[PDB]
Design a binder for this molecule. Structure first.
Ligand SMILES: N[C@@H](CC(=O)O)C(=O)O
Ligand SMILES: [Ca+2]
Ligand SMILES: [Ca+2]
Lengths: 462, 458, 459, 462
C-alpha cells in the first residue's frame, strides 16, 4: 500500500495503482453507473497530454528532463496500456475535472516510475503542475472529447458505408422480383422488391452525408482557452504548437477555434452530431420494421423474405425463427432516441462560461456512435448479406391482387376495368381469369401488359 | 373608439371591446401561435374571479356596491358570454400575468357597463384594485388552471370509460372467434380474437385508473398564497372563504394546500397528469397499430378484421379500405408524447418561488386532454363499434398452421409428433389430414382437441 | 343550400361554400384540434394544382377550355383568396387525402362558378378527374408540403440573420464592458460582456448555417410518382413539365427526385429540418437563461443588465422588471423540443411504400418554423435591441473579486499570489490594495496588468 | 474447450464456463453495449428457476432426483455465486430468449456438476426440457423482471425516504432564517429559507407516494402463460403452486394475473414506473438548480448557502467551491428523461401477443432506478446533511430590498409607501432609513412590523 493526503483526510492506495487521491475521491462522490470511460476517450486524453507536454517543453515552460517521461507515459496511455487505471464514472459532477485529473495522475505516476522515482512523489512530477501545465479542465476535457468523437465517427461512417453498399447489392439481386406495394398496409399497385431495397440504400447514403458533415464543427478546438476562453496568461505559441501536434497525432484536421469564449461555453457542435445520429436511427428502425413484416409467417403473415436464422427462436417451440437481427436494430434506435433527449437537456443546461453537464452528454453521444457502429456491423454480417426473397409467393400476390387492374385499365377503358375489378374482389377470381373469361383481352396480350418492368416504371400505356 | 394610456403610450381600444391596454400589450409582446386560451380556462378564470369578489365582500375588503356588479360580470364569463374577449396567446411570458389581467380587464369593464358607468373608468372599478383584490398572478392563474384541468379530466374519464366498455363489448362479440397468435410477427399458437380485445379493454381500464388517480394532487390549491407562498397581509378568513367558494362553484372537492410555498413553486401535479396521459396513449397507439395490421389486405395482408369505411374509396380499386380511424389515434399518441417532453422541460425550468414556464406547460397539458377526448369519441363512434371479423380466413389460418401441433402434442405422444411436424413443413399439408390417415388419433379425438375453447385455456 | 350525396348519404353544403361532402366527411372523422392548415400550405396546394393543370393541358390530357378556369381558380387560392374554405384538421388520418381533396373541391367549384355553371356539377369539372388529374395524394400532398416548408424556412433564415446581426451589434456596444466570468455559477476570471455577446452571435451564425443546409433535401420532390412512386401510366413529359412549373411558381430550385419510390416512402428530409430547428432552440434557450440571470435583481440578484420593461409593473414595487421576452423564448424552445419528438415518432412510424403519419409531423414541423420566426422577431424588436449594461456594478464585481489574482500571478510569482489571495479571502480587502500594502507591484503596474483588454486576451 | 449442440448447429465452449451454445450464440449476435444484466435480475431469474422446479416436482412433471439438484444450483444463482456467467448483452434481439437460455444453461450445467455428471451433457439435464419445463421465455423473463424491479424499487423508496427526512431536518434547521423570495429571478417579498427547504421535502414526499404506488401493477405476474398467455398445456395446479413460491422467495405480495393474455402482451406497468421516476427527477433537478444558484458566489453570486466542499480547489482560487453534488443530480435527471423516452418508444412497438422490445426497455428501467438510488444516497451523504446558511448575508439582502415595503404598506397608507419605495430604489438607500429620516415610523415600530415570522405567514396587519 501507500498513503496520500488530501484536504478531506488521507487515503490508503494500492502500490500497483497509478491513480491518486483525486481519482479515489471522485469514486466516492460519484458511484453512479459503475461504468468507465470509453477507451477511445482514454486514448484521446493521452494524445492531449502528450501534445501539451511536448508543446510546453518547446517554449521552455516544462523542464526537458521530466517532460520526456510524461511523453513516454502518455504514449503508453495512447496504446491503451493503462485502461484499467481509469476508474471515474462517465456520469460525474465537476464538469469533467475528475476525468482530466484521472489522466493527470496516471500519467504523472507512470512518468515517475519510468525515471526510477516512486509513484506519489508529486514534488518531482506533479499531476497538477507538470502533466496539467498550461491547460484547464475546460480545454483539456472538451478537446479530448472532440478527438474521441471524431475518431469514433470516422469508424461509424466506414461501417455505415459498408452496410449501405450491401443494401445496394440486394437491390440488384432483387431488381426483377415483383411484389405488391402497400399503402396504409392496404394492397396498392405492383412494386419491385429491388425498388424497396434501393429506397433503403438511398436513405442511408443520405444518413452517411449528414453524419459526415457534423465532423466540421468538431474540428474547431479550444486548446489554450484557460478557465473561461480568454486565454489569460496563455502563450500564443503554446497554442499554435499544441494544435499542430493534436492534429498530427489524432489524424484529424483540427483547427484552433477563432473565438475561444464561444468554443468554451457553447455545446451546439455536440447536439449537431446526436441529431444526425437520431435521424439515421429513425430511418434504420423503419427499415427494420419493414423487414420484420416481410419475414412474418411462415403461414399467417406476409412471408415475402427469408432472414438467416441466427438462434433458436422459441424455448418451448423448436421450430420458428424470429427476426432477431432487425429486432436489435429497433432497440438501438430507441436507445439513440433516448440518448438524444438526454443530450438535448444537458446542452440547454449550460450557464455563462461553462456547460457543467458535459459529462452525461459526452457519455450518451459516445454511447450512441459506438452502439450504432456495433449493430450496423453485426446486422450486415448476420442478416443483410443472407436475406433471400420468396419470388414465387410474391408473384402469386401479384396475380391475385386487385391492383394490377391499374396496369390493365388504359387498354380496356375505365368503365369495364372497374367492373372487372369489382367482380374479382367479390368472387375471389383473378383478374386474368376474368379478362379471358369475358374475352376482353387474350392470354398473350396480358402477358405483355403485366410485364414486371413496365408495371413499375413511368410511361404512356400506348 | 376609446383611449387608454400606458407606460408605453396610448392605445385605442375598440368601443365594442372589454379588454384594456394591458391585454393589448400582451398581444404585441407575444404574437406567437395565434391561438387562444381554452374556453374551459376562461370559465375557470371566471370562477376564480367570482369566488374572490364574494370573499372580499364578506370580509369587508371589497365595497358591497361595486362587488355586486363584479360578481354579476364574472358570472357571464363562467357562462361563456365573453369568450371572444380573451385574446392573449397561450404561449406567453409573464408567467400567466396577461391571462390574469385579461380576465381582470374584461370583468372590470363589463361590471362598469352594468352599473351604468363608462368603460375604462378604472377609478370606479379597477382591474388590479378590485377584480384582482387579495390576488396575485401566482395564485389566481394556477388556481383556475387546476379547476380547468380537473373539469377536462372528468370529461376525458367519461369518454374513456365509454370507449373501454365498447372494447369489452367487442371482446364478448368475438369470444368464440379462433385465430393464430403471433409473437415476433411469427406464427405461434392459437388464440381467440375476443382475448386480444379483452387485453385491450383491460389495459384501457388501467389507464382510466391511472388518469383518475392524478386528480387528487390537483385538488390542493394555493389560493391565498399571494406572490410567493407566504400570504403576506392576506386575511386567514379570506383564504378559508375563497377555498370554500372555489369548490362549491367549480363542483370539485378543492382543498387549501397544507403548505402554500410548496403549492406556489412546485409543478409536480401537472407532470403527474401528463405522465398518465402519455402512458394511456402508448397503449392506445399499440392497439391502433394492431388494428391496422389486422385490417391489412384484402389480398396481400392479414385480413383478419374489417373496419367501417370512412374514406370514399376508389371505383377502379375495390377492396382498398384505409384504416383512417386508427391512423388518427396514432398521430394523437405522437402529439401526446411530444406534449409530454414540452411539459417535462417546462417543469424542470422552475426557479425559487415561481415556475414562469407554466403558460406553455398548461397549453400542452390542456391540448393533451382535449385531443384524447376527441379521438376517443370519434374512434369509438366511427370505428370501434362497427368492427367485423373475417371468421373463415382466421379459422383457415389455424387449420393450415404448424402451431396447431403443440395442442395435439400429448395425445399422440412425442413419438409420431415430430414425424407430424417435420413432414407438415415438408408437404405443405394440414395436420388434421395427417392424423386421419396415419391413425394415431381418428376424427372423434381431433374433434375436441382443436376446440376454439380447448387449445386457448390452460 | 346545395345537396351532395356521399357513399354515406346526403349532406347540405352551404350556399357560398366551395368545399364539398368529402371535406365535410374529414370534418366528421377528425374533429381533433379545431385548427386549420397553415396559409402557406394553402398557397402551396394552389401552386401544385396550377402546375398540374398547365402540364395536363400541354401534354394533351386535360381539356383546355375547362383547364383555363382551373388555373384561374388555383391562382386565387395562391393569392390567398379562399383560406376560409380550408376547413380540415391538420391532425387527420388518411395520410393527407382530405387536405388534397379540400384543395381539389375548392378549386373545382370556384372554377365552375368562374365559367358560370352551378357549384357541385362535377360532371363538368371533377375534383377527382380534372383538378387531381395525374396526381395522387402521395405526391401532391408532399410536394405542397415541401414548397410550404421551404418558403417558411426562408422567412426564418431572413429573421434569424437579422437577430444575429443585432446580437453582433450588441457585442460591439459592450466590447469594453468588463465583468466577472462564471463557471459552475462560481466566480472565475474576468471576461468582457461583449465577448459573451459575440459568443451568442456566433452560435446563432452556426444555427443559420445548419438550418439553411436542410433546404437541399427538400428541393427533391416526388411529383409524378403516383401511388407508390412507380409512376404507373404517368407520362414522363407530364412529370418533366410539372416539375419545371413548380420551380417557377414557387420560387425554389426544385428538382425531380432521382428515385421516386425512395422519395415517396422516406421522410428523412423532415426530421433533418426538425433536428436543425431543435439545436437552434437549445442555444436560444441557453442564451435566454443567461439573460434572465444577468437581469435578476435589482437588489438581491446579479443585476448585470437592464432589459426594456415590457410588462406593466406596480407603483408599490419598483425595480421589479420581469424578463418576459427571454421567458417566452424559453417556452418556444420547449415547444420545439416536443414537436421534434412528435416528428421523430411520426417518421419512425412509416410502413412500406407510404408513411401515413405525415399530417401530425407536418403540423409540427410548420409550427416549429412558424413560432421560431415570430418569437425571434418579437424578441429582437422588444428586448435585444434595447439592452443596456450596468457598467459600474460589473466593474466593481471585478475589483472586489479574488479571481483577478490570476492576472497578477505570473508577475509576482506563484507563492506571493497564494499569500495575497489567502488574505483577500480572509479580510475582504481588494487584491489591488493588498499589492500596494506589501509593495509587490506599483500603481503603474496595476493599471497595466488589471487592464480590461489585457485580462481578457492572450498574453 | 468443449462442444455443444442445438437446432441450428454446433459451437465450441470453454470447459470452466457454465453457459452454453445458446448463450454463446447471443454473444455473437449482439455485441452491442458490452454491459451485462443487473445482479438483481440474475438473482430474480434464479428465483423463477427455483420456483418452477419446485412446482414441477410437486405436480409430478419433473424427476425428483434431477429436480433436487436444479434447486440447489438455482439457490447459488440467488446468492450471486455465478453472476460472472451471465454474459448476454442487455440490449438484444429475441425478446429475452437469450437471457432466459443463459439462466437455463448456467443452471443445468451447474446442476450436472453437482450430481457428478459432465458439463454439456443435456441427455441428463436439459436447459430446455428440465430447467425450462412448463415455462416459456414470455412468462419466465418478464416475471423475473417484475420481481427484480420490485426489489430495486423498494430499495429506492427506502433511500428516497431517508433523503426526504434529511431535507425536513434542514427545513427545521433553517426555519427562522430570513431571505428574499424571487419570482422571475426578480426580487419579490421575504421568505424563510426553511419554507423553501420544506417545499423541497414535500414534493419529494409526493414523489415517494407516486413511485410506491407503481408497485401494485407489478405484483400481477403472468407465470403459466406459456407463449401467448393461453397457458397451452400448462397445468392449473402448477400455476397456483409456482405463483405461491415466487411470492415467498421474492418477498413481494405477487398475484397471478386475471387475464394472462393481457399480462403477456401489455407493457403499461413498466411505463407507469418509468413515468413516476421521471416526475421525481424533474423535481430533483429543479431543487439542484436552486441549490447551485443559492451556492453561487462567493462575491458575484447569491451566496445564500454553503455546500460541503467535495473537490479540491487551488490555493489561487480560495472560496471557489463548485457544487459537484447537485450537478450530478442534474445529470442523473437528464439521463432518466432520456431513459423514459427509450422506454416510451419500446413499449409502443409491441405487436400482437408479445412486445419484443422489452430488453432495451427493461435495461433502461433498471438503469433509472439504480442510478437514482445511487445519487440520492451520495447526494444526501456528501452534500445535503452538511449545508449551512449564510444568515448574515441573507438578512442584509432583506434590509436592502424594496419588497419589505409590502409589509410596511398597511401601517402607512398606499401613497406614502409608494413614494418611499421609489425613492429607496432610485437613491440606493434602505427603506428603514427613509422611514426614520422622514419620520413615518420609528426604529421600534419597524422592528415590530419587520418580524421574520409575521412577514412570511398569513394574517391581517393590526
Ligand atoms: N420469445 C419466444 C418464446 C420463447 O423463446 O420461449 C417467442 O415468442 O417466439
Ligand atoms: Ca364475417
Ligand atoms: Ca449604464
Amino acid at each position: 500500500v501507500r498513503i496520500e493526503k488530501d484536504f478531506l483526510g488521507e487515503k490508503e492506495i494500492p502500490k500497483d495503482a497509478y491513480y491518486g487521491v483525486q481519482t479515489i475521491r471522485a469514486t466516492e462522490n460519484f458511484p453512479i453507473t459503475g461504468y468507465r470511460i470509453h477507451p477511445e476517450l482514454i486514448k484521446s486524453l493521452g494524445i492531449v497530454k502528450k501534445s501539451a507536454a511536448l508543446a510546453n517543453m518547446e517554449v521552455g515552460l516544462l523542464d526537458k528532463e521530466v517532460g520526456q517521461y510524461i511523453v513516454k507515459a502518455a504514449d503508453e496511455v495512447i496504446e491503451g496500456k493503462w485502461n484499467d487505471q481509469f476508474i471515474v464514472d462517465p456520469i460525474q459532477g465537476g464538469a469533467g475535472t475528475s476525468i482530466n485529473m484521472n489522466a493527470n495522475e496516471v500519467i504523472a505516476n507512470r512518468a515517475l516510475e519510468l525515471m526510477g522515482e516512486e509513484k506519489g512523489n508529486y514534488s518531482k512530477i506533479s499531476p497538477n503542475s507538470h502533466v496539467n501545465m498550461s491547460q484547464s479542465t475546460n480545454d483539456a476535457f472538451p478537446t479530448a472529447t472532440h478527438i474521441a468523437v471524431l475518431s469514433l465517427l470516422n469508424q461509424l461512417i466506414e461501417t455505415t458505408k459498408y452496410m449501405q453498399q450491401e443494401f445496394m447489392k440486394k437491390a440488384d439481386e432483387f431488381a426483377g422480383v415483383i411484389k405488391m406495394g402497400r399503402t396504409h398496409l392496404q394492397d396498392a399497385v405492383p412494386i419491385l422488391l429491388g425498388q424497396e431495397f434501393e429506397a433503403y440504400a438511398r436513405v442511408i447514403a443520405r444518413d452517411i452525408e449528414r453524419i459526415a458533415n457534423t465532423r466540421n464543427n468538431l474540428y474547431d478546438i479550444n486548446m489554450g482557452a484557460t478557465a473561461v476562453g480568454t486565454g489569460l496568461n496563455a502563450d500564443p505559441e503554446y497554442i499554435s504548437i499544441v494544435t499542430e501536434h493534436l492534429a498530427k497525432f489524432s489524424g484529424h484536421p483540427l483547427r484552433s477555434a477563432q473565438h475561444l469564449v464561444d468554443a468554451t461555453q457553447n455545446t451546439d457542435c455536440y447536439t449537431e452530431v446526436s441529431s444526425a445520429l437520431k435521424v439515421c436511427m429513425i430511418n434504420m428502425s423503419k427499415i427494420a420494421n419493414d423487414l420484420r413484416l416481410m419475414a412474418s409467417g411462415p403461414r399467417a403473415g406476409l412471408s415475402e423474405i427469408v432472414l438467416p436464422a441466427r438462434q433458436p427462436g422459441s424455448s418451448i417451440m423448436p421450430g420458428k425463427v424470429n427476426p432477431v437481427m432487425p429486432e436489435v436494430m429497433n432497440q438501438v434506435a430507441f436507445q439513440v432516441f433516448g440518448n438524444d433527449l438526454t443530450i438535448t437537456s444537458a446542452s440547454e443546461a449550460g450557464q455563462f462560461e461553462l456547460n457543467v453537464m458535459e459529462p452525461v452528454l459526452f457519455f450518451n453521444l459516445i454511447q450512441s456512435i459506438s452502439i450504432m457502429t456495433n449493430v450496423f456491423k453485426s446486422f450486415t454480417e448476420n442478416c443483410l448479406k443472407g436475406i433471400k426473397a420468396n419470388e414465387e409467393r410474391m408473384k402469386e400476390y401479384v396475380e391475385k391482387s386487385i391492383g394490377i387492374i391499374t396496369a390493365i385499365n388504359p387498354h380496356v377503358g375505365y368503365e369495364t376495368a372497374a367492373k372487372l375489378a369489382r367482380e374479382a374482389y367479390l368472387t375471389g377470381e383473378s383478374i386474368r381469369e376474368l379478362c379471358i373469361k369475358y374475352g376482353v383481352l387474350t392470354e398473350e396480350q396480358l402477358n405483355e401488359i403485366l410485364n414486371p418492368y413496365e408495371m413499375i416504371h413511368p410511361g404512356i400505356a400506348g
